[PDB]
Amino acid sequence: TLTYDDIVGTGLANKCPTLDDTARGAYPIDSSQTYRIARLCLQPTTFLVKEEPKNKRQEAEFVPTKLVTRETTSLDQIQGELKVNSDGSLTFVEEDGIDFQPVTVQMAGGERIPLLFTVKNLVASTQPNVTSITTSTDFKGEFNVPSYRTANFLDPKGRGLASGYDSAIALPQAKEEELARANVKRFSLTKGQISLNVAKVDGRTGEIAGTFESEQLSDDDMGAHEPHEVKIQGVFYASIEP
Amino acid sequence: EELVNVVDEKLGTAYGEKIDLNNTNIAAFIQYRGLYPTLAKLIVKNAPYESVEDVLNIPGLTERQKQILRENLEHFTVTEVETALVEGGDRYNNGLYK
Amino acid sequence: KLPEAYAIFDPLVDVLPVIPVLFLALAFVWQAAVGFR
Amino acid sequence: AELTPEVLTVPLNSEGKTITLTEKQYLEGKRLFQYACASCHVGGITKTNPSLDLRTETLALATPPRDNIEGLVDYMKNPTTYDGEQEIAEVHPSLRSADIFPKMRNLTEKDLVAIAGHILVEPKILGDKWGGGKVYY
Amino acid sequence: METLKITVYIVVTFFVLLFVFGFLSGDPARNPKRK
Amino acid sequence: DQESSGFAWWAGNARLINLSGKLLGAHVAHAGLIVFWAGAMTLFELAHFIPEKPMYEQGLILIPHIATLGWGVGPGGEVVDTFPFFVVGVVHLISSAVLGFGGVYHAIRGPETLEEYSSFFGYDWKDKNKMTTILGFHLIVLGIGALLLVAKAMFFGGLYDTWAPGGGDVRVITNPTLDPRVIFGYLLKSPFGGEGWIVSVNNLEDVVGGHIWIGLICIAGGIWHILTTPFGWARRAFIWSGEAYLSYSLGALSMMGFIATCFVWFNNTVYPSEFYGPTGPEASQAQAMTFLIRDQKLGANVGSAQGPTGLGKYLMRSPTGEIIFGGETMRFWDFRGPWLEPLRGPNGLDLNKIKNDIQPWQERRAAEYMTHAPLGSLNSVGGVATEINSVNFVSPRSWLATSHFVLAFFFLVGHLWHAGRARAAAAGFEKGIDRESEPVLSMPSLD
Amino acid sequence: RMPAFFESFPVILTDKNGVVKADIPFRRAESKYSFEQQGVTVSFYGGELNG
Amino acid sequence: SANLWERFCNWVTSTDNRLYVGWFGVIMIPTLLAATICFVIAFIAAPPVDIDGIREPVSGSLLYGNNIITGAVVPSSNAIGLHFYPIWEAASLDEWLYNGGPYQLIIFHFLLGASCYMGRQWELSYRLGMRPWICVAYSAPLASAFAVFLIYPIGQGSFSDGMPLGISGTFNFMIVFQAEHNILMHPFHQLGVAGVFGGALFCAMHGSLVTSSLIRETTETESANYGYKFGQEEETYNIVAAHGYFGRLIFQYASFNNSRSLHFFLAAWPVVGVWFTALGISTMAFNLNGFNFNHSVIDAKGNVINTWADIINRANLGMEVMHERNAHNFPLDLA
Ligand code: CLA
Ligand code: CLA
Ligand code: CLA
Numbered sequence A: 001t002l003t004y005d006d007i008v009g010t011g012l013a014n015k016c017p018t019l020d021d022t023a024r025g026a027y028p029i030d031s032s033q034t035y036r037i038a039r040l041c042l043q044p045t046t047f048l049v050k051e052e053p054k055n056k057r058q059e060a061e062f063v064p065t066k067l068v069t070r071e072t073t074s075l076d077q078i079q080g081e082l083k084v085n086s087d088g089s090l091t092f093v094e095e096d097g098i099d100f101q102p103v104t105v106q107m108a109g110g111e112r113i114p115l116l117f118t119v120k121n122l123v124a125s126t127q128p129n130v131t132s133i134t135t136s137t138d139f140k141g142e143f144n145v146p147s148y149r150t151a152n153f154l155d156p157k158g159r160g161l162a163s164g165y166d167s168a169i170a171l172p173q174a175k176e177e178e179l180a181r182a183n184v185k186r187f188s189l190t191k192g193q194i195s196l197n198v199a200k201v202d203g204r205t206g207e208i209a210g211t212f213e214s215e216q217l218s219d220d221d222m223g224a225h226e227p228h229e230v231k232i233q234g235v236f237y238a239s240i241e242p
Numbered sequence B: 001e002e003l004v005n006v007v008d009e010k011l012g013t014a015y016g017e018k019i020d021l022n023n024t025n026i027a028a029f030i031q032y033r034g035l036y037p038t039l040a041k042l043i044v045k046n047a048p049y050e051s052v053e054d055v056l057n058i059p060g061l062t063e064r065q066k067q068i069l070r071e072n073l074e075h076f077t078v079t080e081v082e083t084a085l086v087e088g089g090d091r092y093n094n095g096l097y098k
Numbered sequence C: 001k002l003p004e005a006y007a008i009f010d011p012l013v014d015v016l017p018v019i020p021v022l023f024l025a026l027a028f029v030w031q032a033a034v035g036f037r
Numbered sequence D: 001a002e003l004t005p006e007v008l009t010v011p012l013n014s015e016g017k018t019i020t021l022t023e024k025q026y027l028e029g030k031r032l033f034q035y036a037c038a039s040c041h042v043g044g045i046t047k048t049n050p051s052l053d054l055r056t057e058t059l060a061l062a063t064p065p066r067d068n069i070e071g072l073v074d075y076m077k078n079p080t081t082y083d084g085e086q087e088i089a090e091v092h093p094s095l096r097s098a099d100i101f102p103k104m105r106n107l108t109e110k111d112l113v114a115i116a117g118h119i120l121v122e123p124k125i126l127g128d129k130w131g132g133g134k135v136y137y
Numbered sequence E: 001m002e003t004l005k006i007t008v009y010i011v012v013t014f015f016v017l018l019f020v021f022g023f024l025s026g027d028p029a030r031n032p033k034r035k
Numbered sequence F: 001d002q003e004s005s006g007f008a009w010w011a012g013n014a015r016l017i018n019l020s021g022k023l024l025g026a027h028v029a030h031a032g033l034i035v036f037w038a039g040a041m042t043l044f045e046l047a048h049f050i051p052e053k054p055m056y057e058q059g060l061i062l063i064p065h066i067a068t069l070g071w072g073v074g075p076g077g078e079v080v081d082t083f084p085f086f087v088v089g090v091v092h093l094i095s096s097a098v099l100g101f102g103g104v105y106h107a108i109r110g111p112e113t114l115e116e117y118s119s120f121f122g123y124d125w126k127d128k129n130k131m132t133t134i135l136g137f138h139l140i141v142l143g144i145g146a147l148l149l150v151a152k153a154m155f156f157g158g159l160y161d162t163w164a165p166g167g168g169d170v171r172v173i174t175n176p177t178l179d180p181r182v183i184f185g186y187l188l189k190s191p192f193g194g195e196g197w198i199v200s201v202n203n204l205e206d207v208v209g210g211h212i213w214i215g216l217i218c219i220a221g222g223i224w225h226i227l228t229t230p231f232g233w234a235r236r237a238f239i240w241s242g243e244a245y246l247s248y249s250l251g252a253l254s255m256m257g258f259i260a261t262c263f264v265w266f267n268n269t270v271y272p273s274e275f276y277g278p279t280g281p282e283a284s285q286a287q288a289m290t291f292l293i294r295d296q297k298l299g300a301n302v303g304s305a306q307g308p309t310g311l312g313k314y315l316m317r318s319p320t321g322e323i324i325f326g327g328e329t330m331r332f333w334d335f336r337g338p339w340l341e342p343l344r345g346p347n348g349l350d351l352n353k354i355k356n357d358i359q360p361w362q363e364r365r366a367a368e369y370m371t372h373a374p375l376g377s378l379n380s381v382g383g384v385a386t387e388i389n390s391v392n393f394v395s396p397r398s399w400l401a402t403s404h405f406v407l408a409f410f411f412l413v414g415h416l417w418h419a420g421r422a423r424a425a426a427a428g429f430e431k432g433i434d435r436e437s438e439p440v441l442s443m444p445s446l447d
Numbered sequence G: 001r002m003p004a005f006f007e008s009f010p011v012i013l014t015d016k017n018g019v020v021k022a023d024i025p026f027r028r029a030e031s032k033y034s035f036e037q038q039g040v041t042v043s044f045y046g047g048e049l050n051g
Numbered sequence H: 001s002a003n004l005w006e007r008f009c010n011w012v013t014s015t016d017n018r019l020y021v022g023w024f025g026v027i028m029i030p031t032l033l034a035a036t037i038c039f040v041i042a043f044i045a046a047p048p049v050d051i052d053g054i055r056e057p058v059s060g061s062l063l064y065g066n067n068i069i070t071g072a073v074v075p076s077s078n079a080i081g082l083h084f085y086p087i088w089e090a091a092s093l094d095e096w097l098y099n100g101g102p103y104q105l106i107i108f109h110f111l112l113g114a115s116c117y118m119g120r121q122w123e124l125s126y127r128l129g130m131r132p133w134i135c136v137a138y139s140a141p142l143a144s145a146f147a148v149f150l151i152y153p154i155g156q157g158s159f160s161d162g163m164p165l166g167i168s169g170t171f172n173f174m175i176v177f178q179a180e181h182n183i184l185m186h187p188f189h190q191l192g193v194a195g196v197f198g199g200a201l202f203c204a205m206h207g208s209l210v211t212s213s214l215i216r217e218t219t220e221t222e223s224a225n226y227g228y229k230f231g232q233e234e235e236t237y238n239i240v241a242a243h244g245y246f247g248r249l250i251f252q253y254a255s256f257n258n259s260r261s262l263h264f265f266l267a268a269w270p271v272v273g274v275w276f277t278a279l280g281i282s283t284m285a286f287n288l289n290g291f292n293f294n295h296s297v298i299d300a301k302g303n304v305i306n307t308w309a310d311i312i313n314r315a316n317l318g319m320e321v322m323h324e325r326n327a328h329n330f331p332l333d334l335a
């Protein structure tokens, strides 16, 4: 119905597919038939950042933060095969799509926490004995959190990993010892965890919807400082097909 | 307790001497007879190789493609997949041009 | 693409656009002859 | 007295023969080169695919070999990838596709010779400049 | 944030008005002696 | 005339402020230089124009206008027949002799005042009515002209249509956009990014409808004026002087001069881009198209590809969420063009389509445009300032937009110059402060 | 060496006749003379690092 | 009364108000106060602004690591482009600040007020019965502020481009512009220079000569300045002794003697010249750049002989390459 000249600017292009309160259906899983996920969407809604320990080991919590970017957060076009291995459980294997978005949120104090909201190489599974996906179903799994910046990124003073300066070019005769940290750009790579909990179904069309929560790490800045912990709470659509 | 630049370090290995099947970027193959266009995309598109010869075992290769690969194996090598060099599709567009 | 027949005018056709400039230049020859009354 | 007929001698065939193009052809080759190439191959590079250039050594490792007249000529008639695997006359100007790349329509077997002959003489004059760019401007 | 948009337009309109009228108010007239 | 009697030599033409007869010849003679040009230059173009070589690659700017009206083009702007060009060019070149004859005559032989030579043609500046009359006529004359376009579209051959369903090609509009809503909409549409202003207009239905909606307004005014006189406020508002009348018409042109510089630089519709070069944003877009394709057609997974900053080389999102092309081109995510739309979906550039619906005609069209972007030097040397010689070319889109901003600007300067002079020649002191009665000398000091 | 003029200067290493033999790259993507790749070393004489 | 509006219109138009608020001034006054006030705060405190499109925020304010010379108000983001980004279009000030909202607010307002300021520079003259045109001499600077803050961006597609409000970022705008348009090699700039360079030259001349021919009316121990009295009757120096010397310096007719004819040449030279540079920036805004003589003077064999135009280009490349290091993904800089 709605087209491009229909959505452009409304920012509806970031929010993704809903299911009118009719859901609660059940999509029959054949097991004798191969299933795949046409389009898996993940729409961020809330970002929290565990307050850096106070040093005083007294249970740090995840505080809310303000989105300093715009409506450039959603993950969409994600697809891959929804494998039906033994014991009825389903396993989704992420194949390709717009599975990552650089988000930057301004935190309570003053800071600005840029993270790489993603679900790359995601592989989520469900409860054993899954017959007809229902509101009781849900997936969980890990995924790879690449690295905010690529090997090619240069810093304000020129230094970089796969390219760029070797050192503090502007301080020719200073001690390199203490500048090491920032002159050698390391490229991290870590694991992230999610869990999509189905809230609506449409037995017919074969499309489920729901809420998701994932936890990952922030940007370490080519390893200049420690990364902050993030938790993302959003919504997700998912069109399943044989 | 030393910080190390993975890329400069990798220019000590075979990488920096021969085309690394697991790391080097696709445009590296445009330096040997009929190897680029079609094979390069294959080589690269086929995960890491536990060792040079393993190229020879890529799916649906023609007894001709296979013949060439054997010819150029002497220019290939293999090293641990290095994220900094592989991540971000850097193997199809490492950001360089003329 | 100037139809063959006319193609004996290429040289002329090539100069026509500049004429207008000339007017402004002739208007200066006029005032020079009239001593800029 | 610098662009001598020796600097104008480039491999004709792949077996070994050579052709000593005239200073008349050269110039015309250049005119034709800017007419249908430069747009994308200025300085002997490639705006829409920097990976492949027109450096003589590069054409040599091409497939089939393009480091000679016949080869370049074949190309302008029916282009293929650097491996020869695919015919690419539908996205690269050629005679096999003049209906889509008009400029090519004029071109005649004679022209094709010059344009080609030009791609082989330039690097003889310019040297490294012909290959890369910016860096060498 | 919407309230700020309203305000501003109200505010911008007030002045745009003043300007248009002020000249319509027979400005030519205001000067030493309109020959 | 003379200086010791009129003005000053370099101010000559003001010596005609009150000599309508000559002032007619001035206007006629000139209105001949424009036609002369339109004509003399179209043949200069044509005499060089090469049937099958991009127009934009040949420094043409007049022929492109004629082609857009649907004259000697055919599919994709194929330049099917040159004659319409030769035809249009000469007609003008001749009508210049006519007008030229009038000017020379009316500014020499003819009466140098229409006073008694004919009381209907004679006119009075302060005559706050014979003006409203003359205006009225002209207002009708323009109307007839506007309607001429609608004719060429709805009845005689149609016009060019880049957006042509089959693809660029002449098309007869037969569904002009009537309705104030859509038409006048463009009128109050922000001139800022995205929602353009008048420069939007992406279809000929509207271009035509909009014009139909003009005569039936422009002529409606041409009458209301030949049938009335300025109301109260109207009189106590403007300065009724010949020079002052000029001023208002000076700013008018200047204001449009920009509206034009913007039109030929941004619009794709009423400036095909098949005849003119590609839009500036259009070319910055096509470079991404070109490489999103080349790399995909080579192993890359453009949808997941992440660039140096973390935004993704080929695709990223816009502030409102749409999926656009990545790189500096993120600024031109407003570009809408024929060759690209088929890859657009409801949320923006769609992956599936991009992944396997990219016909070759686009791959090469996209390449054509990125290699013909609006960049070059004064001595016409296409490309970036650091580029080497060869490929001399400068987009018509540049030449045009460039010239008109100069003209457009200087005219605004001109506007002030006269609007400021006539507005003080009225109060009457444009020649200096009256020694004897310095207004300032009779005003309470401020300190 | 650094020409008193340049705030910063690249480190190029050449042989006897000034042939570029080694250097420190900027874009590793295609280093040909990078140290390591050339296996450069350094020895000291006199001074306190002598030997 | 007599209906306050009638009255209001009289004050607004008072010919004797310390500062002449006019009809134009009714806008100039609030517009410039919004700009000037937002600028002063932005410059002192204000988070780093993601200028280019990426996410590499630049900080320009003082409380964020700058000094007067380096600090600046950074241009709205490239992701924003030419789009209209007012405060109400932000989800929060922080968003507005991070994306460079302050810039748009500040320039749209300065350009509006600076224009009315031009209009105002006419109204008063009129109200004082003096000749107009002063406002036309001021149309040169305005035209230059318009080119640099509005025209150049409309051409390039984004306010991210277009000189940033700060001393050092102004040098940035230039050093880059060169590399992208080879401006020093464009007629309009050279005329800009002849204007600005010339202007100064004549400012020294006029000021020079006049001072050199003041009529002795003071002791040796008291300012030469006292010899003139505000509003005094006749001239205060010998415009003939002036010409008597200058004429002889070069040669009689290669000189002035008509104060009116001389003073006009003073206001026309720099204005005409400065207009042009405005027309250059406004012209190179649509990519009709400066002259290009790269690889001309080729020799007999075809060897390129390099002229100074090349050493130029060589230094231009270096600029072209390093600028906006992380903002490019493809070979050609078409934005
Ligand atoms: C729209 C059309 C227009 C019209 C009908 C008029 C009409 C008039 N003008 Mg205005 N004027 C205009 C636009 C227009 N002007 C603009 C845009 C400007 C800003 C530059 C001016 C600036 C202007 C000034 C400064 C003056 C007038 C004056 C006058 C009056 C006398 C004419 C005259 O002196 O001619 C004589 C003309 C010449 C000396 C020759 C033209 C010289 C120009 C500078 C050359 C440009 C030529 C070409 C573009 C460049 C050559 C190529 C180059 C690369 C070498 C007359 C009423 C005069 C007056 O008395 O005011 C009431 C006066 O002093 N005008
Ligand atoms: C192109 C535009 C243009 C036009 C149409 C006019 C028109 C006019 N000018 Mg202006 N003028 C212009 C530009 C223009 N001027 C410029 C740029 C300047 C600054 C140098 C002046 C300076 C100026 C002055 C100083 C004076 C005029 C005067 C006049 C008026 C009387 C003409 C005259 O005295 O001829 C004199 C006659 C001649 C010596 C003949 C000139 C040759 C003819 C006209 C050209 C024939 C054209 C073509 C080659 C043949 C076509 C023929 C074909 C159709 C068969 C006339 C309305 C006068 C005025 O105001 O009168 C009260 C006056 O004193 N003008
Ligand atoms: C060729 C163009 C043209 C011209 C020059 C005129 C000229 C004139 N008209 Mg006519 N008119 C025209 C076309 C034209 N009209 C058309 C097509 C129609 C439709 C039939 C009319 C209908 C019409 C009516 C109904 C009336 C006039 C009147 C008048 C006279 C004075 C009114 C006025 O100008 O107020 C100037 C306007 C203002 C003081 C308002 C300013 C505020 C507005 C809302 C903002 C405008 C902002 C703009 C959109 C933004 C850009 C601004 C820029 C500076 C950046 C004047 C002689 C009046 C008259 O006296 O009758 C004869 C009158 O009552 N006209």
Ligand SMILES: C=Cc1c(C)c2cc3nc(c4c5[nH]c(cc6nc(cc1[nH]2)C(C)=C6CC)c(C)c5C(=O)[C@@H]4C(=O)OC)[C@@H](CCC(=O)OC/C=C(\C)CCC[C@H](C)CCC[C@H](C)CCCC(C)C)[C@@H]3C
Pocket (backbone or CB within 6 Å): H197, H198, H200, H201, H202, H203, H204, H205, H208, H249, H250
């Ligand atoms: C922008 C460049 C600039 C130039 C070209 C310039 C030129 C001139 N200024 C003069 C005067 C002045 N200039 C003044 C203030 C200024 N002048 C300025 C800037 C300039 N002034 C500035 C910024 C100021 C401060 C406001 C004053 C106060 C005066 C005068 O009183 C005087 C004058 O009379 O005014 C008109 C004239 C002296 C004639 C002379 O000395 O002959 C003798 C020397 C000759 C003939 C030999 C030339 C000597 C030089 C060293 C050699 C240059 C080599 C080549 C000839 C040319 C170089 C080529 C270029 C492409 C680089 C001369 C026309």
Ligand SMILES: CC1=C(/C=C/C(C)=C/C=C/C(C)=C/C=C/C=C(C)/C=C/C=C(C)/C=C/C2=C(C)CCCC2(C)C)C(C)(C)CCC1
Pocket (backbone or CB within 6 Å): C006, C009, C013, C023, C024, C026, C027, C030, F025, F026, F029, F030, F032, F033, F036, F090, F093, F094, F096, F097, F098, F099, F100, F101, F103, F104, F107
């Ligand atoms: C008043 C005056 C003036 C002005 C003037 C003018 C503005 C004029 C115009 C004029 C004109 C405006 C003219 C025109 C003419 C035209 C002609 C004479 C034409 C002819 C044509 C022909 C003949 C055509 C044909 C052809 C063809 C078809 C093809 C081939 C070639 C040819 C070309 C042959 C002046 C400044 C001097 C001075 C003062 C006074």
Ligand SMILES: CC1=C(/C=C/C(C)=C/C=C/C(C)=C/C=C/C=C(C)/C=C/C=C(C)/C=C/C2=C(C)CCCC2(C)C)C(C)(C)CCC1
Pocket (backbone or CB within 6 Å): E019, E020, E021, E023, E024, F182, F183, F184, F185, F186, F187, F198, F201, F206, F207, F208, F210, F211, F213, F237, F238
């Ligand atoms: C849709 C369309 C179209 C159409 C168009 C139209 C319909 C238009 C209209 C238009 C219009 C409808 C316009 C209007 C305008 C206006 C103006 C421009 C005005 C101005 C004014 C002024 C300037 C005033 C002034 C003043 C004041 C304010 C105050 C007091 C005083 C005075 C009087 C001075 C087209 C074809 C393009 C295309 C397609 C689409």
Ligand SMILES: [Ca+2]
Pocket (backbone or CB within 6 Å): C010, C011, C014, F047
């Ligand atoms: Ca010719």
Ligand SMILES: [Fe+2]
Pocket (backbone or CB within 6 Å): H206, H210
């Ligand atoms: Fe003075």
